[PDB]
């Protein structure tokens, strides 16, 4: 499943990411756009970032996994386990700066523009 922007915005609001750990919905939508282009199935060091948030296996999944899920569970058409693992990740202490693409592209911009027009 490759989502659309509004479709995705609605799913993320559904799983309760609008203002989660401080971050408004746009930050999340903005990150999915540049990490996966909204594709729900997507080395260099360890191996493999999985899914629409592109969660790295070295740490978060097993393919000691921190989120307590397999990495296959970051590939289905619904985004539910992804979002749960996202929820643990963003509360390590580094926030959304975990996601590189978020730090270089979304941080500081007008991120509400990603939830305007839906
Ligand atoms: Cl934070």
Swiss-Prot record:
SMART domains: LYZ1
Alphabetized Gene3D superfamilies for the sequence: 1.10.530.10
Pfam families on file: Lys
Binding site for substrate: 92
Expression tissues: In the egg white and polymorphonuclear leukocytes.
Enzyme class: hydrolase
SUPFAM superfamilies assigned to the protein according to its UniProt record, in alphabetical order: Lysozyme-like (SSF53955)
Chief location of this protein within or outside the cell: secreted
A GO term for molecular function: lysozyme activity
Compartments where found: Secreted
Further remarks about this protein from its record: Lysozyme C is capable of both hydrolysis and transglycosylation; it also shows a slight esterase activity. It acts rapidly on both peptide-substituted and unsubstituted peptidoglycan, and slowly on chitin oligosaccharides.
Assembly, per entry: Monomer.
Similarity comment: Belongs to the glycosyl hydrolase 22 family.
Protein name: Lysozyme C
Organism: Gallus gallus (Chicken)
Gene name in the database record: LYZ
């Amino acid at each position: 499943k490759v989502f659309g922007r509004c479709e995705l915005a609605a799913a993320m609001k559904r799983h309760g990411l609008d203002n989660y750990r401080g971050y408004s919905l746009g930050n999340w939508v903005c990150a999915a756009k540049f990490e996966s282009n909204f594709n729900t199935q997507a080395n260099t060091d360890g191996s493999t970032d999985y899914g629409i948030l592109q969660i790295n296996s070295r740490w978060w999944c097993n393919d000691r996994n921190l989120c307590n899920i397999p990495c296959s569970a970051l590939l289905s058409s619904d985004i539910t386990a992804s979002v749960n693992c996202a929820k643990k990740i963003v509360s390590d202490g580094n926030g959304m700066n975990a996601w590189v693409a978020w730090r270089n592209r979304c941080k500081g911009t007008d991120v509400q523009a990603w939830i305007r027009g839906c």
